[PDB]
Amino acid sequence: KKYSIGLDIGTNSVGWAVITDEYKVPSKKFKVLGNTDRHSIKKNLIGALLFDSGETAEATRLKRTARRRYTRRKNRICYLQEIFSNEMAKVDDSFFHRLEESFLVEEDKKHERHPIFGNIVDEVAYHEKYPTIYHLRKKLVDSTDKADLRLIYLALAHMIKFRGHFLIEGDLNPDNSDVDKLFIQLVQTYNQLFEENPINASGVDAKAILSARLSKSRRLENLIAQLPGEKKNGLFGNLIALSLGLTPNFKSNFDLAEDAKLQLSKDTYDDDLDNLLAQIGDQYADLFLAAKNLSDAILLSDILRVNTEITKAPLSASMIKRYDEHHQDLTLLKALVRQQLPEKYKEIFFDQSKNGYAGYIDGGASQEEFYKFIKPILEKMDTEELLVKLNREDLLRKQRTFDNGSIPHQIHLGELHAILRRQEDFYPFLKDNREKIEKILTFRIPYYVGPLARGNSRFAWMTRKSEETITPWNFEEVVDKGASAQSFIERMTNFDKNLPNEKVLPKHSLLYEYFTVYNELTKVKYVTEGMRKPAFLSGEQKKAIVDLLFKTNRKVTVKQLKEDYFKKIECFDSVEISGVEDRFNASLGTYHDLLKIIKDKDFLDNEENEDILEDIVLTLTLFEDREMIEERLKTYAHLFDDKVMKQLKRRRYTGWGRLSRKLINGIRDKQSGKTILDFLKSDGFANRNFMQLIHDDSLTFKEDIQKAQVSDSLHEHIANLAGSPAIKKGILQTVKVVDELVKVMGRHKPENIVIEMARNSRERMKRIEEGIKELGSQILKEHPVENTQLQNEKLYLYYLQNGRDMYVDQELDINRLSDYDVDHIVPQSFLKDIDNKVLTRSDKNRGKSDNVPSEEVVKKMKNYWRQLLNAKLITQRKFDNLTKAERGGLSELDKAGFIKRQLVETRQITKHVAQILDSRMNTKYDENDKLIREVKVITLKSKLVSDFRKDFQFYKVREINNYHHAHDAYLNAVVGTALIKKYPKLESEFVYGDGKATAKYFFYSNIMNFFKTEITIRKRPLIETNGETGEIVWDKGRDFATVRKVLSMPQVNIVKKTEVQTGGFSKESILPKRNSDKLIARKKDWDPKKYGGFDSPTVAYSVLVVAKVEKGKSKKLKSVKELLGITIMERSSFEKNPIDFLEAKGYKEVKKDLIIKLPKYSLFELENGRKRMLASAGELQKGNELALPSKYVNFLYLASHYEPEDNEQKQLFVEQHKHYLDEIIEQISEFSKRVILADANLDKVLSAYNKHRDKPIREQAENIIHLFTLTNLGAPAAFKYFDTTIDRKRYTSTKEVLDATLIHQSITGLYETRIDLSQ
RNA sequence: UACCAGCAAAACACUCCGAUGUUUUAGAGCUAUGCUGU
RNA sequence: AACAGCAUAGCAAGUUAAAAUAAGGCUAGUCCGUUAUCAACUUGAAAAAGUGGCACCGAGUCGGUGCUU
DNA sequence: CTAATCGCCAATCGGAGTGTTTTGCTGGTAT
DNA sequence: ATTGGCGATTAG
Q: Nearest nucleotide by C1' from A1079 CA?
């Protein structure tokens, strides 16, 4: 009767409590089912539930994409084999068969073991003549005589399998050994163009400056700093930036009226040039073309590093250079090492475990490690050119490395084209297949088509045109393209809120602009001298205003209307408008753009054919490709001319609206007979806005909208919500707990529900590296900071400041972080708030210590301030407050708003949860069609309870039990109920559903004042009661006593969720061959003992089975029962058939009645109160937890910190109570000698405590908290007392739990079933 | 509780490509001494 | 005797290529396979439905007293 | 002599495109 | 950010 519920939600737990009218927790006795002796148990109603966290769906996507790419790459080679498999049968019958059985040992091969020539003599000559494949490629490109076609196949296959990147669109030709020649040609052309203003070459090597491993902006700055008088905006700078590859704005260089920007990496450049070529061509004609050639010589500059005009194969000739320097250096190093230090020969060239040359070729060492290990040896012996090579990273190098990711596919295409044209006269079948071969290399699926499916995938949306296969030679005749792009966009755009069955208009529709104009100008309220009361304008006056103002300019200022509309046609001088803030946000811009392009107004003004305009506007905002738009615009080709068709091609919009057209010009009133547009155009003296037209009960808009809104499930809704899945898991569990609690207590509803919601190295390193690179500093490479230091705030702030003291401009010491301090820009007392803290050794340099820092720092280093802003080492809040320091100061209304915001919740997730719970709880109506409310849902904050605790001495320590979750859940409800009972005027703020600044400050700062005694000089009534009704609210002689009694109970329900594991099969590494039974085969015909495989799989659940087995040699029959694990790989076979699966293992005569399934975290109970949980088929975890009295907790909290006359009393209390540590240690020992059962660790702990025993109480009270880790719930771990480390204790047996009691629990823990395992 | 506005961030859901890394096999190893043998 | 394998001692060379990249499946496609959901028992393919008495004194993981099925 | 302990171990980098909420200073307006 | 597998030596 008249109870209430309090909840606490989090990422990994949910806490619940139920309270009565006098702040008491009830108790009840519950039934017990099973086959044991016990048949009743008494329990209280308070507790918490713990579970594991959810994850995102990012890894699955990556695996899916990788799978698809592997399949497609495998399919790519079969077409080549199909082309080649008609003449290869006349030179070697079994060439292709031998190439797939290369992985097998020489007892399952079925052919010979030389899979190129099939012989021993002519297999070594090939390797002697062609050490690599690049030798063969160069020879085939350059030679002139007939060759064996197996070699041709091998070269072509190597080219097709690995084929470079697709980052550049266009045509490319190799001529890069003339960077300075092309540079000087461009400079000469520039001088020819500007004879009045010549530019000197200055003899600067563009190769060095423009090939630095930095950003392009820095390179441009370095290049432009050499020549004085020229900046980035200069014409020469713009041209050189286009050549370097960037997006330069050309509007200012020729005072162009419209934007015109060109980039060299897009297809548009082939046509956009024509635009700039429109009103030009006598000059600025070749000055562009030459620039293009320059872009060719800079891109392919550091890649080739070989001469030209000798061979037409630069890449294959630039890798034969590597396989000469390697050979030349190895001999010299060998001779030197043998000559000078003969003792260290065997370690470098023979030992295969230490980072040598033998560990670099057939070992497991990278190149950086090899460079580090050999440098100190090289300097001791003396022979110096090798050091110079090392410092450039050009020492002994290989061919297939990690820096090959910058090779385009045009080079491979060129080499293929060269090879195919030389042999086409000896082999006529190569003459008529060249294009088919190149199409295999060049083809690529666009991103707006997707998988080529047939109706069995939930990711595909493609639409077909015929019924054939989609080989890459008929892709444009079987696949429909435009419809695919349309469906690609339309599957993920939004719907209409008012009508859930209509799509949203584009943001740039003509009707949308008409609507916003007719809306923003319907509530405009002007007052003149003649009429004291302002009135509404007439419809025709508004039409005239649109004619003379809205169709004349781009945007209208607030003063332009007043100075034009009322000046000539109205002849009035006074007008005030409030409805718009100083700037008209609504304008007809698309109308002006179209009127410019098509240059006739009769077509646009007449309204008989607006549908075509809507169609073209929708078309332009949908397709991202030029050809598709050009082909789709063809239906209306006769209405216009080709000249305007050329310009309509180059026009693109973006954005999607928020309401449909059936709502604006589709739904008509059944009484008035006008659509919304008519009302916005003509509404009489009562000119209402669309929001006001919506609210007309008399009109039929209400009926249609309500019927549409009236026209499922819980998981669907929670999934459709927005946020992280952890919060969703919490919400679902909370709902289920509430239903169970309502069921337990007699199918009655409560009165109140109170809820509250609680509160990197890679990204830190990438941010630090970016900040270093942007400023061009050298602090990132100074030291290899560990991830722990990266997480460390001191080192993070040091790195973001670059080791420079912000206030004084001097280099910070790396070892002075201890003496350094952290300063906040705005005081916490001023505004209680990583973007607000800075590092400095002295805080007095900021200026005033109790205000915003003075302007001296900014006025003296604004240059570095701007530099740090560019480098992103200073935050947006940081520089915003720095600018506000000069632009003003601080007020008190902002502080009032801030305290109101910190007292009132603002997030939307809490509101969604409250709405779900409300809609579920009270669902009854009356005759008047208003819902009867009988349950109140409240949300408060996280700071009320903390203030209550710290004021009234109810302290919390988080490293002893798991009880604080339930205690917080309990403390929420008391405070919420008391506040709502005292002040019935705060529902409109705190409850879901539906001078003065100083007064609000006082009210919201002393809302929690009626609980306390003498205040500071003013005593209070002992009984506090409601001034409206006389009901008792708070009694200070009893309520604190009952709260303290409830806060120290020994029995609280705590449960853990049981789940079945799911995910990957095993570990991902492949191991060498070994003689063991713990290796899993990769395929069915590959034996692990001869090929290697995986290890260490994961289990899903265990099974308990009792049956007969044979253990021995004489076929002795016996009985046994034990636990067997089922893995993720064979779960399916076990579920399909259990008996045969088990008989395959060895067991016989299995009784299909005693098989028991056991998931993770199953609860077993032993004789003396010990409890165990199951982690696998061979591991256990603890399941107990201990309770300490309250005085010990309070003393530990007070003695840890140990950091105004009132505080001295606690200072003396801590000293006066000295003899509590012995009691705490004895409690720990007594708990550990009954349930934990560990001996060596306990002895070590006791000995260490006895031995140390002489240090301050603060220091000995900050280590028992660490010690508490021995006695906890979950997985065992490691810890440190003072300087000694204590290792892990693990329970590796599982046989005992085979004679214990198994417990089955419900969600709330109140309903139980017990089963005895002695059957 | 919904509609314009300027921006700058953040998170979440899909599609298309590049370079490495790991496991077996093929690129005949030479000379001197001793043991086992068909 | 050769020949082959073993253990010892010396000197020579080394940079490249073919195949697999979750075992597999039927729906045979240039398609699908690591996210979200899950105590026990009765009826139901499945979804789904149902199953457990109240007050009082106390407190080392819940115990006792009075009334009912 | 066989179970129980002790110590080590765990796939990683770069690019292009589309759509949606959510903060947090803005404003208006209105409901 | 851990927490369960696996090979090699050692007590009851």
A: E6
Nucleotide nearest to A131 (CA to C1'): C16
Is any atom of nucleic acid chain E found less than 7 Å from the CB of residue A1178? yes
* A1252 annotated among ligand-binding-site residues: yes
Question: What type of residue is A343?
Answer: E
Nucleotide nearest residue A51, measured CA to C1': C38
Supply the DSSP string of A312-345, one letter for each residue.
S-HHHHHSTTHHHHHHHHHHHHHHHHHHH-GGGH
Of A267, A281, A286, A280, the C-alpha closest to A650 is A267
CA dist A321 and A304 (Å) reads: 11
Resolution, rounded to a tenth of an Å? Answer: 3.0
Neighbours of A1064 (CB within 10 A): 11
Convert A1016-1039 to b/e letters by CB count within 10 Å (16 or more is b): eeeeeeeebeeeeeeeebbeeeeb
- Residue whose entry in the numeric block shows the structure tokens 């849902």: A937
In contact, A483 and A691? CB cutoff 8 Å: no
The method of structure determination was: cryo-EM
- What is residue A1285's DSSP assignment? E
CA nearest neighbour of A1109 among A1094, A1121, A1125, A1092: A1121
A1299 is in an annotated binding site: no
Known catalytic residues of A? 8, 824
A724 touches strand B (CB under 7 A): yes
Token representation of residue A840: 């400095």
Closest Cα to residue A949, out of A928, A970, A935, A978? Answer: A970
Q: How many Cα atoms sit within 13 Å of A1300 on the Cβ side?
A: 19
Token output for A794: 């001191």
C-alpha torsion angle, residues A855, A861, A863, A865 (rounded to 10): -70
CA of A392 to C1' of B25 (A): 37
Number of CB atoms found within 10 A of residue A923's CB: 10
| Alpha helices (H) along A682-758 | 690-694, 701-710, 715-720, 725-744
Measuring from the CA of residue A1052 to each C1' atom, give the nucleotide at the shortest distance. Answer: C61
Chain-centroid distance, C-alpha A909: 19
Question: Which window residues (854-893, chain A) lie with Cβ within 7 Å of strand B?
Answer: 876
Q: Where are the alpha helices (DSSP H) in A610-721?
A: 610-620, 626-632, 642-649, 676-681, 690-694, 701-710, 715-720
Alpha helices in A690-724 (DSSP H): 690-694, 701-710, 715-720
Instruction: Label the pairing between strands A1179-1182 and A1279-1280.
Output: unpaired
* CA angle (A416, A417, A420) in 5-degree steps: 85
Residues in chain A: 1319
Q: Give DSSP secondary structure letters for A212-252.
A: SSS-HHHHHHHHHHHSTT--TTSHHHHHHHHHHS---B-TG
The reply to whether A756 sits in an annotated binding site is: yes
- Measured from Cα to the C1' atom, the residue closest to E5 is A1096
Q: For residue A121, say whether its CB is under 7 Å from any atom of strand B.
A: yes
Calculate ∠ Cα A845-A847-A850, nearest 5°: 120
Residues 694-753 of A with CB under 7 A from strand E: none
Q: Which nucleotides of D are covered by protein (CB under 7 A)?
A: 4-7, 10-11, 14-24, 27-31
Query: What's the Å distance between residue A530 CA and nucleotide B16 C1'?
Result: 69
Burial class (CB in 10 A: 0-12, 13-18, 19+), A445: middle
Q: Crossing angle for the helix pair A409-420 and A434-442, nearest 10 degrees?
A: 170
Protein CA A583 to sugar C1' B5 (Å): 10
State how far the Cα of A900 lies from the Cα of A426, in Å rounded to an integer: 89
The nt closest to A1096 (CA vs C1′) is E5
Does A8 appear as a known binding residue? yes
The answer to whether A398 CB sits below 7 Å from nucleic acid chain E is no
Q: Is A965 annotated as a binding residue?
A: yes
CA of A1075 to C1' of B18 (A): 39
